From a paper:
The ID proteins belong to the family of HLH transcription factors, however, their lack of a basic region accounts for their inability to bind to DNA, distinguishing them from the other basic HLH (bHLH) transcription factors. The crucial role of the ID proteins lies in their dominant-negative effect when forming heterodimers with other DNA-binding members of the HLH family, disrupting the protein-DNA interaction. By regulating the levels of Class I bHLH proteins, ID proteins can effectively control cellular fate by shifting the equilibrium for Class I:Class II bHLH heterodimer formation. Our study further validates that ID proteins, as with their other HLH counterparts, appears to exist as homodimers in their active, native states, rather than monomers.
We have solved the structure of the ID2 homodimer HLH domain (residues 24–82) at a 2.1Å resolution, coupled to a stabilizing 14 amino acid linker region (LKPSFLVQSGDIAS). The asymmetrical ID2 structure contains one homodimer consisting of α & β monomeric chains different predominantly in the loop regions. The final model of the ID2 homodimer contains a 54 residue α-chain and a 47 residue β-chain representing the HLH domain. The topology of ID2 is, as expected, similar to other bHLH proteins such as E47, MyoD and NeuroD, with the same parallel, four-helix bundles. The main difference is the absence of the extended helical basic region in ID2 compared to bHLHs, hence ID2 is highly unlikely to bind to DNA. The dimeric interface is held together by a hydrophobic core consisting of residues M39, L46, L49, M62, I69, I72, L75; all of which have equivalent reported buried residues in the structures of E47, MyoD, E47-NeuroD and ID3. Besides the hydrophobic core, there are also three inter-chain hydrogen bonds at Y43α-Y43β, L49α-Q76β and Q76α-Y71β. However, our structure reveals C42 on each monomer pointing away from each other; their distant proximity does not allow the formation of a disulfide bond. One of the most striking observations in our ID2 structure is the presence of a positively charged ion near the N terminus of the loop, the first observation of its kind. The size and the interactions of the ion with the side chain oxygen molecules of K47, V50, I53 and Q55 (with distances less than 3.5Å) suggest that this ion most likely corresponds to that of potassium (K+).
Author numbering:
A (entry chain B): 35 to 82
B (entry chain A): 30 to 88
The structure:
Amino acid sequence: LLYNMNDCYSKLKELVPSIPQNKKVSKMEILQHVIDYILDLQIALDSH
Amino acid sequence: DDPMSLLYNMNDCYSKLKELVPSIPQNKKVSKMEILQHVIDYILDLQIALDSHLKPSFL
Ligand SMILES: [K+]
Ligand SMILES: [K+]
């Protein structure tokens, strides 16, 4: 379960292939990679 | 640094996520944390969809 804000950002780092998990990344960068990743997943989904 | 400028841009990212994620109501304000929660569930769904169900080999 996602109980706090940091748990949410950390989860997103795991889920999004393009977000590095072994160097520092900003919250802002996380949001942008998440956005791009969603756009990619949606076009793939739409193909079906 | 321009603290508020970066915050407005983060805020823009949050608003975009509101558009992208179906489960999120757009004609209503939603907290940043709830937005990330909807985002996480939605990405998980899309992954399961694309990784398993949408495969020809899916049983
Ligand atoms: K990752
Ligand atoms: K929406």
